[PDB]
Each structure stands twice: as structure tokens, then as C-alpha cells.
Amino acid sequence: TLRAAVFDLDGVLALPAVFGVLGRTEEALALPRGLLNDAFQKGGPEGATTRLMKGEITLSQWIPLMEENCRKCSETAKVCLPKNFSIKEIFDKAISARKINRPMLQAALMLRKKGFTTAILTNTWLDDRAERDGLAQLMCELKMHFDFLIESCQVGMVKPEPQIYKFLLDTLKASPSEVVFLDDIGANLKPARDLGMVTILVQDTDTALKELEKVTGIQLLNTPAPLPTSCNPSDMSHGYVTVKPRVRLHFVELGSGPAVCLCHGFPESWYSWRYQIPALAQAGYRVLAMDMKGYGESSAPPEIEEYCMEVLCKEMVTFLDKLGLSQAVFIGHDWGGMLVWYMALFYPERVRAVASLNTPFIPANPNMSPLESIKANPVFDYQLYFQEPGVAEAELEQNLSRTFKSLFRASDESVLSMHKVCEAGGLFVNSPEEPSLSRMVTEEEIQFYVQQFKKSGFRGPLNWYRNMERNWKWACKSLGRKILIPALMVTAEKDFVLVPQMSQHMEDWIPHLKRGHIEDCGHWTQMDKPTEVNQILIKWLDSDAR
Amino acid sequence: TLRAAVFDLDGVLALPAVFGVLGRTEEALALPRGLLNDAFQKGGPEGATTRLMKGEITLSQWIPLMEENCRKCSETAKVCLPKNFSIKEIFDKAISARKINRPMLQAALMLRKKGFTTAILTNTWLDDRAERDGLAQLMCELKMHFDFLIESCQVGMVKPEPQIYKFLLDTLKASPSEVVFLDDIGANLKPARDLGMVTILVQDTDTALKELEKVTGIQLLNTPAPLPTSCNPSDMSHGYVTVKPRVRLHFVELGSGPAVCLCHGFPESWYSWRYQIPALAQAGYRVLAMDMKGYGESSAPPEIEEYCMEVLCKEMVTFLDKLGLSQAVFIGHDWGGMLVWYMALFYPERVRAVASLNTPFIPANPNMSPLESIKANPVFDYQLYFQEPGVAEAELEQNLSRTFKSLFRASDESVLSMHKVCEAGGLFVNSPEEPSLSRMVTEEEIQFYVQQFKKSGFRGPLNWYRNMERNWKWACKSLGRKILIPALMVTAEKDFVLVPQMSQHMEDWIPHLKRGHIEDCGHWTQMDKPTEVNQILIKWLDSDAR
Ligand SMILES: O=C(N[C@H]1CC[C@H](Oc2ccc(C(=O)O)cc2)CC1)N[C@]12C[C@H]3C[C@H](C[C@H](C3)C1)C2
Ligand SMILES: O=C(N[C@H]1CC[C@H](Oc2ccc(C(=O)O)cc2)CC1)N[C@]12C[C@H]3C[C@H](C[C@H](C3)C1)C2
């Protein structure tokens, strides 16, 4: 009974196989067949390549040794090498052209989700080339999806030596019959097979995967579109910035490149961006997923005014001051979405680009109170219910598990009616005590929000709604301004509070405004439609936030 | 009696004054005198410029309004503007050319160190230009050195209106007679003077500063070279990465750009890089100042083997994996210096560039035990004293204040003899119980190390020395390798343990090796010679680590 799956890198997890460059280069340079491949493997276990793969020498130390071997092979074959022939050039092109074999990684991901222990066993080198980063990046993306990465140059052993296979079994803590071994080289499969492991000679991915699903009894081939990579809270880098003596802000940080500050809505967490964090980091960005003031590990002072937009924005500026960031791209959802438009309005020098999910830019009406403006919309009734301190806190904190399960639902899953909330007496009047689990969330994900909300509760989060007059007065100072920095508005078809039509007049204030739209998407955009959110944000970031 | 100093930005803290572009552009374009200056101030308090400075409109909204004013002024003067005349072009050039007035900032720094409350009061705009970052960066560098920054566009008030001066007094919590007000515009000084404040019309910095020192009774002019900016632990972003279930690594993070990982020595802290952190962040780097395993907020497991170079290096690789960093430039001092050469040897794909302070790259002697090799040098005796678990811990933890005060000393301040330590019985046998404070450190700085060492003590730190045989066996695997990635070796003339001559044969292993050298520098390089360390590292980073 199989419990582990082992994959090679070259020709298995990454395509095209770097070994294949030698065959094509020979064919392009009209060189004799197998000349480059024979000079590469010249000397066998005592040769320059085995020394490289064992970690005795580095790639740059190997280049002149392979050049000698190529000259020796051309001398014997009675042929001449071209005038400007370069092994570094050939290898640089072979490595940079090699990409992740997405369907193989998907199959590995599926086997791990199903309880398998997964590992990458590869014959590789210590790369000290000027362009080593390309390969470094490839390995980083791949490695994080496996339980183990065994590299020949790090263990001082090489395939097909039987020692690396016993090392693999020991690392795995599994007997050979419990292991599937995927490799594109038949000579490297023999020892695993000879040990008793299930082996798959990988030629085309499709057949390899067909052989894989047959031996595992798990569907891997032509299975549905997987959700993007999520975040395990314990594996993240956690950052803490004191913005004021009583106020500290917490954030999760991943990636390198231009700073992308993610601002969640109500009643959420940095974890609301769980499906965007690994994707924006992989796309070339330094993501900073905030716990906004009043939430999770961020401070939650009790006073209402600590949560007005003026104070929240000043503290986000200080957060950048203390981190040594002159700018950041600001991406907000819901209450975070409103915060980001005001960051762009009051601090454009600090905002590289601004993006909002669901929340339109809504300019203050100087001829009307916000309480009047709220009353004009029946869908906004819950905001009046949120006004009296203590009332919504007591109902939302009574059963944390019920609160998040009732709230975090897809458009066809609604168990809550946000209309006539005040007259009913509460948010959960004709709502189930034990709501069903939404298809958007797992029990574990809901429990992370429950755990987060145990520290400060709902006072701080609800205080974001308790500054209408203060926010209105502050917003009126910006009534003659326009948003002229790069800006993205993303609407969600099925958000029944923040309806797409609420964003219709945004171009009057933001003329160069770019847009995105998500159909069959409810209020909880990031977890409802993570794949499309990632696609819209990444495309916009690369074009406008550089 | 003066207690506060207020400085304007344009023409005072930053030169050349942006107002001066209008005069030079007129002169370059052979335009009538004062034409650009008159169109800029056109309409006075009701004009486009006052609206800009009050925050009613943004800079990009202002550009076409200034263009109208310029056309109106040319129409009256009966002159024509050039065919490709652009206010955006003129202003972009004026802003980017404007730099910090270093001697004025130094005087502000000196007044604050002497107990003054300092502030920047400036007439400024909301900058939404594509090139706003240049100005954002300028303000970030400057603002962090003052208690307050009052910007006209944020307070909705402008100089010379008397309201901004009463707002300043209220922000300051000082009466007018306690305030020095520095401004390059006489019209903007009048209200401060009329209120009773000491005022200085700033023309040339030298005279302004001469007037400043006379009224303050504090030497500001031609005073010694100041130490680089240091770090206040409470104002930093603190990062936490779990690398293994029992091991968490702590770091301080500042700046944006290529990742620079700083690795301290024994018995130190991230705080040993206090003078390098703000300088490398200002030079365009994302600094990650580590608390190495066994130190400060990083985990300190008790077992000896948790501190061998193989485990320490693997955990630094994981630290990069979890932060989403494919590479980092690795800069080490002392034990951190040794760790970084081994990072370059075993993980060149993860190391962008490598730099060491004092620690040479020393390749393992396969024909000798490290215990034998240590005994060959009388200056290395303390390492044998460090071997027996508990002995050096008990002596180093007995009096934390004494330990750091005795250790952290300049070359002419030595109170400790590291020779014949074993025979004497300890590290502090003929050492004072109450050592004098070194000129390199303050009492507050020593107390930060005392506080840090109260958590785990010296077991973890001392365990770095207790893996000689293990480190030796591991290092022998790299005996055929060369360091071919960018590398910097920095020697300190007066380091009597890690003598510059110990680095003499490094080019045999690292042929492209670059060097730096610091004279009159002891073991504690970063705090001994911070200015020269910053100059050497910054110059090397910009040339080799890009
Ligand atoms: O109220 C705001 N968020 C709510 C958070 C809770 C959610 O509850 C839901 C959502 C969906 C469902 C479902 O499908 O069953 C049920 C309950 C409703 C939206 N957002 C703002 C954002 C800005 C600033 C201010 C005024 C205006 C513009 C709306 C708050
Ligand atoms: O021992 C190492 N650091 C000491 C830390 C304490 C300091 O104590 C001092 C220093 C100066 C003074 C003074 O001026 O009074 C007094 C005491 C002496 C140096 N560094 C290593 C770094 C690598 C790896 C291993 C072997 C070799 C190479 C030396 C440890």
C-alpha cells in the first residue's frame, strides 16, 4: 500500500529536460550525434560530471572541465567545434528555458493532500553562475510543495548509486513497497525497482500520470481546477511595528520586489488574503498582509476615535515610515478598500498604485449627513444596528463559530438577511444556531478566525463604523481633488451590499481608472473567487504598479 | 530660554530652493524677470497656488492652472513663451535636483540630542506626479530626525497665515519665546517674530547656523564628525520566522531593494549592526538584521549540535524559504563572518554576494584536528576555555553588565587578556569588577545587551564553539571548491585575534575577492568604526551586489 511519491526534477517536475539541450545543440551546430552527451558523461563515476553532482566542485569550476571533454571527443570523432562555441552559453540557455511541469506538480499536490509523503530526489550541482537566481527561484517555488528535497550535491551521493536510494528510504521512513518513484532516466529507476519500489519511466507526462493514478487509486488526470496555494499561519514570517506607544500593527510578509500592502475588511484578518499571498509573492512582489487596527495580533484600543479614517491613514503612513518604505501599492477589500482610496487622496506620494475589491470610491455629500445617506439605502440597515456600543459586540462575540460560518458564505448560500436587522433585533434573529459549512471555507479556516477574534473581540472592528461624522468632515477637505495615481476598481456581480452599479460614477473622480469584474462572486471576494482575483491583480500590478 | 527649533524645508533643510528654479528658468529661456514667479503666486490667497498649498487640489491638478497663469502673464508683459515650454518639466527638474542640506540637518540633530524639540514646518503640496517617489524618499529620510512634521497641505493652513503659527505653538506645547524659527522667506518669518519667537532669515547656511549657535549657546558650526544614525529598538519592525518546530528566528527589517542579511558574532545581537541598519536602508537596500540562533529573541535550544555550521546554514536557507527570498546578500562579522563564507560554499544559489568583517575564509586542514590547529595559536586559548559546558556560562552570566563592558572595548581600552585564560582560571581573573565605560558605547547600549542576555544566557552562544570536529568534517566536503560569487573581505588593523594577516591566502580560494581595510579598528568593527564600515559596505554593494 503506497504511502509516498518521489519525483525527479529534470524531465519530470521541470521541462524541457536540461539533458535535451545537448541533443538539440548537436543538431543545431550539425555536430556528430551524442558528442555533447558523451563529453558530459566522460569518465563515468570518476569524471568531472560525477564530481559536480556529488558537490566536490561548483558549476563554474565544471565549465572548463566539460570544455576539455568536448575538445577530447571532437579529436577522437575527427570533427571540429565552432569558432565561438560556449558551454556556459549552452547551459545558461538550457536552465533559463526549463520551467515547472504544471500537471506533474498538480499530481504531486493532489497526492500530498490525500495523505502521501512527497519528495524531490534530484542529481544537481552547486550553482555559482552570475545567473544562478533563475534556478534558485525555480527550486524555491517547487520545494515548498514537498515534504523533502534531496539534492545529490548536498548529500555527496548520486543516482544510480544504491546509497542515495537507502538515504531516500531513511529520509522517508518508509519501506520500498510503499514508494512510487518517477524518473525520466531508466538507469536511475533500476535501483529503486531492484529495491522493490513502484517505478514509472516518465516520457510524456500524460502516460506517466495515467500510470501514477492506476497504481495509487487516486484521480490525478483531468481532475478539476485546483484552488491557488493557501497560507499555513505557522510557516509565515510575522512582522510587528509599533506606530504609537499604545498601538502596534501586525503583518504577514512574503516575497521580494515592490511592496504590496493588503488591507482586509470587516470582520476579517490578514488570512482573508491567504490565496493572494503566495501568488503575489511568486509574481515578483513583496506582500505585506496586514492585521488592520482592531484585529488579530494588531492592537485594539477601546476608544471610538482611534478608528476614524484620519487616524487609520496616519498610522498606515507611520507603518511605512518605520519599515523604511517610501511607497507601497495599496490593495483593499471592503473597509480596507475605503481606507485605500483615502490613502490615495490624502497621501498620493506614499501610494505607488491603489486597488479596491468591491468598495467603490464614494465622495462625501457635503449637503447631507452620512446617517441620512445610509438611511436612503435599505441594504445598509446593519450599519445603524452597528452604531450603539455593545449591542452588535454582544451578539457577534456570543458564538464566534456561528458568527463566521453565518457571515462567510457564497452568493447562493445566504442564511442572513441584512435588511430589517434593526426591527428584527439582531444580525442572527431568523438565522440557524448551527449553520452548515460554506463551500468557500473549511472548518479549520473558520477556527483560525475564531482563535483570532478571542483576543480583542468585536469592539475595535465595530468602531470602524462609529466615525461617520468625523470621516465625513475629513473627506470634505478632498472634495476638489482627483485620484490621478494608477487605480484599479474590481466589482463582484453578486455582492448585494457593494453592488457593481455603486461604482458607476468613479471615472468622474478617477479619470484614468482601470477596472476588473468578477461574475458569480459574493461579498467575500478573495475566498469566493481566488483564481480570478489573483489573475486580475497580477495583470494590473505588472502593467501599472511595475 | 529656547527649548524648540523649527525649520522650513525649501531653502532651509533642502537645497537648491525649488522657488529658485523659476528665476533660473526665466534667465535660461531669456524670459522677462519675475514672470514665472508672478504667475506662480498669481491670485494670492484665492489663487491656484494657495489652493495647492492648502491641500484643496493636487500637484497634477495645479500644473494646467499654472500654465494658464503663465500665458496670462506673457500676454500682459507683451512677450511669447517657447514652442515646447512645460511647467511639469521645469518642476520635475526642480524637485529631483533638490537635496538635503546636510549641515542644517546636522545642526537640527545636535539641537535634538541636546534636549530641543525639533520640527519641520513647510508649505507643500499633495504630490501625485509619476515621479512623486523622489520627494517621498527625501521626506522619509528627513522626517525621522524631527519630533514633528507640519505640512500646509495636511493642516489646510498656509504660511504666512497667523493660524499655522498658533497650530505650531500648540503642536510644540511651547510659548513663542522658547522657539527658534528658521526660514528663507522674510514674509513667512514676520508672523513668528510678531508672535515673539526668535527668527533667523536663512540666506547662506553658514551665517544662519552662526546666528543659531549664538542664540542657543550650543556649538553647531564646525563641530566634530557625527556618528551615523543608530536604531531605537522600540521603533523598528520586528520579524519572526519559525524555521523548525522548536526554532524561531528574530530579525529587525528596514528599507526596500535587494535583501541584505546581517549576521552578528559572539556574544552579540542584531543591535551590533545599529549604525549600519539606517545607512544600508537609505542606500537602497532591504536590511534584515538577525538575532542569530542562541541570541536575543531567537530561539536558544540547549543541545550542542543545534549550533554546528551545517544546522545553522540549513536554518538560514529555511529562513529565506519562509520569507519568499530566492537570494540575499550575506554580511557577517566574527562567528557570523564564518557562517557567511560557508553559506557561499554550500549554498551559492541563495547568496547574491558575500561579505565578512574581520573573519577570514579559513579552509579546514584535512591533516590536522581543529583542537590541534587552535593550540598552535596562543591568542586562541579562550576557545579551549569555552569547550567545557557550564564553565564559561557561569563566569559570563555572573555579572552581565561587567561581561559586556569588559568585552566591548576599543583597541587602546583593553582590560582583558585572552592569552593564558585557561591557566588563570577564567576570562575575568585580573579584570576590574566595575570596568569603565568604553568610548565606543553608552550605558544605555550596554543595558540593551544585558536585557537581551537575561532570556537565554550564554549556553546557546557558547555552543557555536563546541562543534569543532563536526564543523571540520563538514568543511572537508568543500575542499575542492572555490568561492566564485561576489565576495568582500574587510580586515581591522587592531583586531588582535582576527589579525589582517590571517586573510593573506584568501585569493587562492576566492580569486575575484575584493578587499576593504580599517585602521585603528579593534574586534568590534561595527561600533568601533561605523562611518568607514558603512562607506566600505555601501560602495561594495552598489558595485557588486547591484
Ligand atoms: O459595511 C460594510 N461591510 C459589510 C461587512 C459584513 C457583510 O455582511 C454580509 C455579507 C454577505 C452576506 C451574505 O451573502 O449572506 C451576509 C452578510 C456586509 C458588508 N462595508 C462598508 C465599506 C465602505 C465603508 C462603510 C460603508 C460602505 C462602504 C460599506 C462600510
Ligand atoms: O573566537 C571568536 N570571537 C571572539 C569573541 C570574543 C572576543 O573577545 C575579545 C575581543 C577583544 C578584546 C579587547 O580588545 O579587549 C577582548 C575580548 C575575541 C574574539 N571568533 C572566531 C570566528 C571564526 C570561528 C571561530 C574560530 C575563529 C574564526 C575565531 C570563532
Same domain, B109 and B89: no
User: A147, A256, A546: best mutation site toward chain B, by most B Cβ within 10 Å?
Assistant: A256
CA–CA distance, A148 with A170 (Å, rounded to integer): 12
* Closest-approach residue (CA) in chain A for B155: A477
CA–CA distance, A332 with A351 (Å, rounded to integer): 12
Last residue of a domain, one of B217, B249, B277: B217
The DSSP element (H or E) to which A111 belongs, if any, is helix A102-113
Please name the residues in contact with B458: beta carbons below 8 A apart, sequence gap of 6 or more: B267, B392, B393, B396, B397
Q: CB-based burial of residue A252 (10 Å sphere; 0-12 exposed, 13-18 middle, 19+ buried)?
A: buried
Q: Is A5 helix (H, G, I), strand (E, B) or coil?
A: strand
Q: Which residue has the cell 541636546?
A: B114
CB A178 within 8 A of CB A2: yes
CA–CA distance, B437 with B325 (Å, rounded to integer): 40
CB A330 within 8 A of CB A483: no
Does any domain span residue A181? yes
Same domain, B22 and B2: no
Does residue B409 have its Cβ closer than 6 Å to ligand 2? yes
CB A428 within 8 A of CB A395: yes
Q: Which residue has the cell 540562533?
A: B293
Please name the residues in contact with B306: beta carbons below 8 A apart, sequence gap of 6 or more: B247, B293, B460, B463
CB B539 within 8 A of CB B251: no
DSSP line for A115-136: T-EEEEEE------STTTHHHH
> Which residue type does A119 have?
A
Q: Which of A384, A497, A506 is the pocket-test mutation for ligand 1 (most atoms within 8 Å of CB)?
A: A497
Measured in whole angstroms, the distance separating CA A210 from the mean position of its chain's CA atoms is 29
A14: cell is 521541470
CA–CA distance, B389 with B386 (Å, rounded to integer): 8
Residues of B involved in catalysis = 334, 465, 523
Instruction: Strands of A179-255 (E only): list them.
Output: 179-183, 198-201, 237-244, 247-254
B232: cell is 531605537
B184: cell is 528663507
> Which residue type does A221 have?
L
Same domain, B50 and B185: no
Contact A237 B236 (CB under 8 A): no
Q: Which residue has the cell 556574544?
A: B267
CA–CA distance, B500 with B520 (Å, rounded to integer): 12
Q: CB-based burial of residue B83 (10 Å sphere; 0-12 exposed, 13-18 middle, 19+ buried)?
A: exposed
Other Cβ atoms less than 10 A from the Cβ of A215: the count is: 14
- Maximal CA-CA distance, chain A: 95
Q: Is A241 helix (H, G, I), strand (E, B) or coil?
A: strand
DSSP line for A279-342: HHHHTT-EEEEEE-TTSTTS---S-GGGGSHHHHHHHHHHHHHHHT-S-EEEEEETHHHHHHHH
CA–CA distance, A198 with A180 (Å, rounded to integer): 5
> Which residue type does A296 have?
G
Measured in whole angstroms, the distance separating CA B333 from the mean position of its chain's CA atoms is 17
CA–CA distance, A84 with A67 (Å, rounded to integer): 12
User: B128, B148, B235: best mutation site toward chain A, by most A Cβ within 10 Å?
Assistant: B128
Does any domain span residue B229? no
Q: Which atom of ligand 1 is nearest to the CA of A338?
A: 23
Shortest distance between the Cα of B293 and any Cα of chain A, in A, equals 16
**Do the annotations mark residue A495 as ligand-binding?**
no
Same domain, A183 and A83: no
DSSP line for B18-73: TTHHHHHHHHHTTPPTTHHHHHHSTTGGGSHHHHHHHTSS-HHHHHHHHHHHHHHH
Question: Between A and B, how many CB-CB pairs are < 8 A?
Answer: 161
Same domain, A156 and A298: no
Q: Is the peptide bond before B160 cis (omega within 30 degrees of 0)?
A: yes
- Could you tell me the CA-to-CA distances from B115 to B1, B101, B188, B341, B475 in Å, in that order? 12, 22, 26, 44, 53
Q: Is B353 helix (H, G, I), strand (E, B) or coil?
A: strand
Contact B61 A481 (CB under 8 A): yes
What's the total number of domains in chain B? 3
Does any domain span residue A229? no
Please name the residues in contact with A194: beta carbons below 8 A apart, sequence gap of 6 or more: A162
CA–CA distance, A390 with A18 (Å, rounded to integer): 64
Instruction: Strands of A358-493 (E only): list them.
Output: 487-492
Q: Is B10 helix (H, G, I), strand (E, B) or coil?
A: strand
Dihedral of the alpha carbons of A450, A456, A457, A463, in degrees to the nearest 10: -140
C-alpha B334 to ligand 2 mean position (Å): 7
C-alpha B244 to ligand 1 mean position (Å): 39
Q: Which atom of ligand 2 is nearest to the CA of B360?
A: 28
CA angle centred on A497, ends A493 and A502, rounded to 5°: 70
Shortest distance between the Cα of B53 and any Cα of chain A, in A, equals 13
CA–CA distance, B487 with B325 (Å, rounded to integer): 20
CB B42 within 8 A of CB B48: yes
| Rg (chain B; Cα; Å) | 29
CA–CA distance, B339 with B356 (Å, rounded to integer): 9
Same domain, B172 and B293: no
DSSP lists the bridge partners of residue B248 as: B242
- Could you tell me the CA-to-CA distances from B425 to B415, B419, B430 in Å, in that order? 16, 11, 10
Q: Is A149 helix (H, G, I), strand (E, B) or coil?
A: strand
Contact A133 B346 (CB under 8 A): no
- Could you tell me the CA-to-CA distances from B237 to A336, A416, B286 in Å, in that order? 22, 40, 12
CA–CA distance, B408 with B439 (Å, rounded to integer): 10
Q: Which of B418, B439, B493 is the pocket-test mutation for ligand 2 (most atoms within 8 Å of CB)?
A: B418
Q: Which of A126, A234, A287 sits opposite B242 (nearest CB)?
A: A234
Same domain, B307 and B396: yes
Does any domain span residue B222? no
Same domain, A187 and A266: no
Last residue of a domain, one of B166, B182, B217: B217
Contact A326 B242 (CB under 8 A): no
Dihedral of the alpha carbons of B189, B190, B191, B193, in degrees to the nearest 10: 80
Q: Is A78 helix (H, G, I), strand (E, B) or coil?
A: coil
Does any domain span residue A222? no
Residues of A involved in catalysis = 334, 465, 523
CB B368 within 8 A of CB B401: no
Domain CATH number, residue A156: 3.40.50.1000
Same domain, B486 and B500: yes
CA–CA distance, A70 with A282 (Å, rounded to integer): 38
Same domain, A200 and A91: no
Q: Is A17 helix (H, G, I), strand (E, B) or coil?
A: coil
Does any domain span residue B226? no
Q: CB-based burial of residue A143 (10 Å sphere; 0-12 exposed, 13-18 middle, 19+ buried)?
A: middle
Please name the residues in contact with A205: beta carbons below 8 A apart, sequence gap of 6 or more: A15, A101, A103, A104
CA–CA distance, B417 with B413 (Å, rounded to integer): 12
Please name the residues in contact with A355: beta carbons below 8 A apart, sequence gap of 6 or more: A329, A330, A331, A332, A340, A487, A488, A489, A490, A537, A540
B104: cell is 542644517
Intra-chain end-to-end CA distance of chain B, in Å: 50
C-alpha A407 to ligand 1 mean position (Å): 10
Does any domain span residue A227? no
CA–CA distance, A141 with A99 (Å, rounded to integer): 11
DSSP line for B468-496: HHHHHHHHGGGTT----S-EEEEEETT-S
Closest by CA to A405, choosing from A374, A371, A423, A428, is A428
Domain CATH number, residue B22: 1.10.150.240
DSSP line for B434-462: SPPPPTT--HHHHHHHHHHHHHHTTHHHH
Measured in whole angstroms, the distance separating CA B280 from the mean position of its chain's CA atoms is 6
| Rg (chain A; Cα; Å) | 29
How do A237-244 and B237-244 pair as beta strands?
A: antiparallel
Same domain, B470 and B502: yes
Does any domain span residue A225? no
CA–CA distance, B30 with B19 (Å, rounded to integer): 18
Same domain, B70 and B52: yes
CB B94 within 8 A of CB B87: no
Dihedral of the alpha carbons of A131, A137, A142, A144, in degrees to the nearest 10: 140
CB A289 within 8 A of CB A270: yes
- Could you tell me the CA-to-CA distances from A204 to A22, A27, A88, A103, A201 in Å, in that order? 19, 22, 28, 11, 9
CA–CA distance, B36 with B25 (Å, rounded to integer): 8
DSSP line for B235-261: GSEEEEEEEETTEEEEEEEE-SSSEEE
Contact B137 A57 (CB under 8 A): no
Other Cβ atoms less than 10 A from the Cβ of A227: the count is: 11
The DSSP element (H or E) to which A497 belongs, if any, is none
C-alpha B467 to ligand 2 mean position (Å): 16
Q: Hey, whose CA ends up nearest to atom 24 of ligand 2?
A: B335
Resolution (A): 2.2
> Which residue type does A525 have?
T
Contact A139 B349 (CB under 8 A): yes
B17: cell is 530652493
Domain, as residue range, for B340 = 236-546
Last residue of a domain, one of B38, B65, B96: B96
What does the DSSP 8-state code read for residue A439? T
Q: Is A352 helix (H, G, I), strand (E, B) or coil?
A: strand
CB A404 within 8 A of CB A440: no
**Do the annotations mark residue A381 as ligand-binding?**
no
φ, ψ of residue B222 to 5 degrees: the values are 45, 40
CA–CA distance, A7 with B14 (Å, rounded to integer): 60
Please name the residues in contact with A176: beta carbons below 8 A apart, sequence gap of 6 or more: A169, A192, A195, A196, A197
Experimentally, the structure was elucidated by X-ray
- Could you tell me the CA-to-CA distances from A441 to A451, A525, B382 in Å, in that order? 15, 12, 58
Q: Is the peptide bond before A267 cis (omega within 30 degrees of 0)?
A: yes
Shortest distance between the Cα of A347 and any Cα of chain B, in A, equals 7
> Which residue type does A15 have?
L
The DSSP element (H or E) to which A190 belongs, if any, is helix A186-195
